[PDB]
Amino acid sequence: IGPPLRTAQIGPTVGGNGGRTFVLYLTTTINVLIAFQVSWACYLQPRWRSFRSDMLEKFPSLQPDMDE
Amino acid sequence: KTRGDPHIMRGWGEYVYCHYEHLREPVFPRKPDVAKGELAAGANVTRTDVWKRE
Amino acid sequence: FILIIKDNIILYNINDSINYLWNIGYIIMVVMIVQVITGIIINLYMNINNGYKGIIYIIKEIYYGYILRYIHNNNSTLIYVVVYLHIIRNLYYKTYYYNILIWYSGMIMLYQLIIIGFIGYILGWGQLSYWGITVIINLISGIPYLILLISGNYYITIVTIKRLYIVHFILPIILIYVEIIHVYYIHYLINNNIVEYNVNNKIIFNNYILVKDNNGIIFILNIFILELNNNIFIIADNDNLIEINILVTPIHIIPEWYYLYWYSILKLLPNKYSGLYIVVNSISIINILSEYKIVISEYKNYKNIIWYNQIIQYISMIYIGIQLPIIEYINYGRYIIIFNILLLIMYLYPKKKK
Amino acid sequence: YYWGSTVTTEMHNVSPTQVTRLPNGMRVATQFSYTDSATVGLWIDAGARYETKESNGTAHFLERVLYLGTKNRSRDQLETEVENLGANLNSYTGREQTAFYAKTTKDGILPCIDILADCILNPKLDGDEIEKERVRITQDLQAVNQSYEELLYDKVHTACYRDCSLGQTVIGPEENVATIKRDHMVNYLYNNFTADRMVLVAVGPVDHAQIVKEAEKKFANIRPTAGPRMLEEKPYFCASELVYRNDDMGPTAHIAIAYEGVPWRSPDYITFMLMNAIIGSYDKKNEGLVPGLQSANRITQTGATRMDVGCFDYYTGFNIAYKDTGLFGFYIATDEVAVEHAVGDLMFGVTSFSYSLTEEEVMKAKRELKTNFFSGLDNTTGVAEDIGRQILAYGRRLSPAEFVERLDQIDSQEVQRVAWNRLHDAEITMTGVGPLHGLLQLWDLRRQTWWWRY
Amino acid sequence: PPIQKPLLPSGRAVLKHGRSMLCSGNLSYDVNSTIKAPECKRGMGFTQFKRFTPVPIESGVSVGNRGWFFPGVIPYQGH
Amino acid sequence: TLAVYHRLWGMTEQFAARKKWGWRQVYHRMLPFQIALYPSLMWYLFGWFDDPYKEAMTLGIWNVSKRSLYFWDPLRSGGDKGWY
Amino acid sequence: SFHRAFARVVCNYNKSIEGSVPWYQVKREKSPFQQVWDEVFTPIWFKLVKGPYERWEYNALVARYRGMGIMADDAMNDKDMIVERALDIIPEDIRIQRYRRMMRGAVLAGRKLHLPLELQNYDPMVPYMAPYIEEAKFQMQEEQELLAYHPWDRRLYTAGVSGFGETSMHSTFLTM
Amino acid sequence: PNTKRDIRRLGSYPVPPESKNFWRGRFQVPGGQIQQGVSPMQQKIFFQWWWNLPTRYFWRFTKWSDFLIPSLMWYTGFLMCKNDVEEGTRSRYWY
Ligand SMILES: CCCCCCCCCCCCCCCCCC(=O)OC[C@H](COP(=O)([O-])OCC[N+](C)(C)C)OC(=O)CCCCCCCCCCCCCCCCC
Ligand code: HEM
Ligand code: HEM
């Protein structure tokens, strides 16, 4: 009779959740690599090509006409 | 008025007000100032000497 | 199984403080069963060799065939409405913070649904459907030779219809199995309440929650019956009733309304793969929105300002998708995508201490 | 991985063990200790293994009758004399080794040597004493009068060594016990209790020179040698099952599972000692300072969690070594319904040695192995057993420093190499008594010696 | 070298309550001694398997309760 | 005695590095499973690759002459131009 | 073997950082660049965005707690394992009042009502759970460090548990 | 299920198989409670909907007003885009 006596639970009381950690790492990895591709192809790459093409005004060794 | 500090947390992120976190504590925790009313519980009692009286 | 049913329906305890937004899931399950049944029955009269002429023969010659045809099309719209609203709810109450397993099981069903709906559109064998698949299939045109293996020819033909039809017949039954895995986790991992904490206010399901859940489903039925018989809302594009002509391109190659968010993403980004990749991000990043947090809180029942701006981002992108590719809409839509990335970063980022 | 040397200065501070061979061939080994009590005895290289099938049991009978009177004393006189010296005479008989040792005070050391020599060399095997002991031995022979740990210890040898004499028991079969006579015992004394096979061990306030002089005088007339033992091939290990299913003896089941071990002198013997330590022992009724649920022992910890009740009421590892073979395994006493989990976990533990054994568990096991070995050398009898058992097994006594030096080299990788070579995918022998519906077939348990993972 | 003690250390007091090193008898062979060298009734060697814990075994006594159940309450599907 | 306590507190300071080591040791013990995976993949994906790469992947052991007498494309049995 | 070399690298790199002071216990002077940033941006940003936004949210949160009649610490969900381990050891007096407040809050929220204003003049941000949260974290950290420092191997799918770590039977789908 | 302290059962009677989920949602009530109620057959079943009607809709509209400023910024952007599209079309074409 009376309220239950307080007692700590014998642990460890955490663990067994590696599938959730896998999903975290897979999702972060995929989305981190999507950021690189989208940042490159949609912003960096275009601007880089323009610079190189305006760096061809120097035309010390611009690409040859034939060289097929 | 309410004793909470609205700006207790900073940085990018969604706004939250809470008192607690899950972060691990150091081997040698900062000695709490119990004389001024600071709390001493858990790691800052065991791994500190704030409890010793003369 | 009777004891199982009694344990999961008759003696199942749920909090008495839940809203009608906790009835959306019941509706999905019921409307899903209706879509399978009507699909199987329609199959009794359909010839997938020409589904343009087959749909005509159902609506004109079969007795009450018009009911089957329009229910199967309109109940799809309904399925996606209820599902998308079920996600909006789960985001608002952040029901993924402690019940991630339930969230994962649901996302699997979302992926399956996205495939079922698209292929069902192509079974209609109309202009829009033909050209739409011809555009999507050409996104995996980089993977060498895979277009040919999926299509079965160098261009979409009945060969492609005969194989996608089997995926459309079978994949829904698997979805129903994942629904069991979903209801399994819900019953073990107790449902979330309108309040952030856990309270001893639970009541049995059959005597109370099912009566309320039926009031909800019957409310939706009244509205769905009006659409089913009078087309109060245009939920099906008219250009799917034009006979396929491979030589002429449709006025606008757009998907159904429930694929316009991802259609816009693909029409806004300047590189084809970047667009495909940003569609992956949309359906993958939302599965890790609580993983990096470190505070003992579920970020629940705040003003949810970030949530509101996300729900509007979805609606606004669907609008841009309807609109033709006017340059102005593309610039504005690219800003909406940048804003979505930022809102999603806000959810993900843990906070430092002052 | 190597973490340094654990040898200390205190390990070198021990009195040396002096071993000298008398001209007749008897080795005399002594160690001085600052004690007021001593232990002097004879550790012989005799036992049941060196008996024939028809004579099995003679050695045990002789050991029970050797102190019942000599040709120069009587049982009452002998018992009176020992009591007056404030001493006690002990003796044991095993498969490969035997001993007759007295625990006395300092003044009783030499007098006890005389008493033991008379018993060993001039035993008066009176018929009346034999007949009374025949009854006592027969009663003990009854399995109803034997514990289940004694029964499974014997049956493990019966199952594993069907082809050689190591399978024989010490007490012997009841047919032989019924027929043993004085002539049998006299023959056994003549053939086996010879000087070349005896070691006189004296531990305590003793002087090697004095002990040697007394030993030569008292054991002058011992038979110098007997013919060399017949050369035999390695004892064949038979992977068999000998289970005594009995659902009328209570709820507790006793199961012993054995692998083929290594001989005493094998380079891998210390590795097997450490592996035995890693397995350890656990009793639900004596759990210690650390509970099972939070034990560093992996077998104990996983077992304590099974069904929220625990699948090991008791278990212990065992590492038994003989001159040319050995047995390595575990013994379980557990609830009937828990047997499948219990044997499965302990086999998973032994299989883990070959895949995933942590440095932490090894280092803990080294310390508890050294804490058990050193504590056994506390009293004179413990030292005397160590000297006599180690000279018979190795021809010399390994120092505590040498044991620690060799143990330092053994690490997790060395345990893994030895286990992979000898215990992985290895043949096993299962023996059991009790309610054993849950015990599977031998082939089913033998597949648990390897993993699909890793 | 040989191991002369069980792998499970007793951890209990050797001398019994009220008994001293003077009045405990001879601990090597006294019946009440907790360290009495066992009897070789059937030979030497069985001590490597013997359970030296004095308390008789209670089959199935629970030791894996982390405080999740009261005594006498039967867990159902681990809950 | 605080010195003893300091060491006993500090013996677990580097938990994150020990748990990382344990998982790396698991990952090391899974590395050998590649020897069966990678070849099994190429075995299943062999027909996807072009004839030129099929020959390199096999170190010349496979070539067009090794295609079955009754090739899955009947018009290309015995070569791309047929037997004769 | 290249694994044996990596094991030495890891062993030597960790031996060289034993006893290091954590980043938060080092007296740190902000970089001059950060100081300039914290004198231009931080002030204006607080006066125009952060300050007002976070006061707007905080005041709303206090009102919501007052309407429910609950404290801030009542709002914690016991599905969090630190909260559960703390709730094991709270005294009965705190426990009783905590339950009654949470019960009243759920009744009011379910019935779409609010606490009478007469009962709303209290400070909802009193941290009554703090002592027990800290004790629970200490207990969990000891268990983590002394009992969970390695990915242990166990027999899989036995005794109603997957063998991958969880301790409750029939707590996964594959363990039904 | 609920916390292990909450689902810990005082009784020794076995959990019925059909009530597994029910007893995994048990709570250990601290201090006690006195729950009361009346059958719906002896009560007004629609009045409370009317009684709570004003407060329900007041507290709903006051919370939903939080989104007003967000809503206005988004509509301003919608109008700006619409006009930008129209002027751009009239500029590219429309002589
Ligand atoms: C598009 C490319 C896709 C490539 C996919 C490649 C798939 C390859 C699948 C291989 C088998 C995987 C089985 C599950 C993982 C092992 C789990 C495990 O170890 O469990 C431990 C558990 C526990 O074992 P343990 O290791 O603890 O040992 C305990 C003791 N004994 C051994 C007695 C049990 O073991 C099992 O229960 C697993 C048994 C092995 C199951 C193997 C199934 C093989 C099925 C056929 C494979 C066909 C390959 C096709 C390749 C196609 C390529 C395109
Ligand atoms: C997740 C469940 C399902 C959804 C979301 C789905 C979706 C749809 C869609 C959007 C259509 C196009 C309707 C139109 O032409 O406008 C369609 C067509 C069709 N579906 Fe389903 N479907 C489901 C399951 C099924 C099932 C189980 C079957 C039965 C095998 C089926 C049979 C058919 C048939 C025969 C058609 C072509 C006739 C038609 O155009 O109406 N469907 N489906
Ligand atoms: C085929 C579509 C699906 C159906 C049949 C369905 C069904 C249900 C059911 C019946 C419920 C319990 C009742 C409820 O609280 O409303 C529920 C809960 C839940 N579902 Fe789904 N669902 C589906 C889609 C999804 C998706 C796509 C997600 C993830 C984005 C998801 C995540 C969740 C979550 C987190 C809960 C728990 C909510 C709470 O905590 O109570 N569901 N679902």
Ligand SMILES: COC1=C(OC)C(=O)C(CC=C(C)C)=C(C)C1=O
């Ligand atoms: C990411 O998945 C999606 C949703 O769920 C969050 C949506 O709400 C919406 C928006 C739905 C409506 C009814 C406007 C769509 C289309 C979507 O793609």
Ligand SMILES: COC1=C(OC)C(=O)C(CC=C(C)C)=C(C)C1=O
């Ligand atoms: C016809 O056009 C269609 C799109 O256009 C790009 C889509 O994005 C989508 C959505 C695609 C994914 C991967 C979510 C579909 C299904 C579609 O039919």
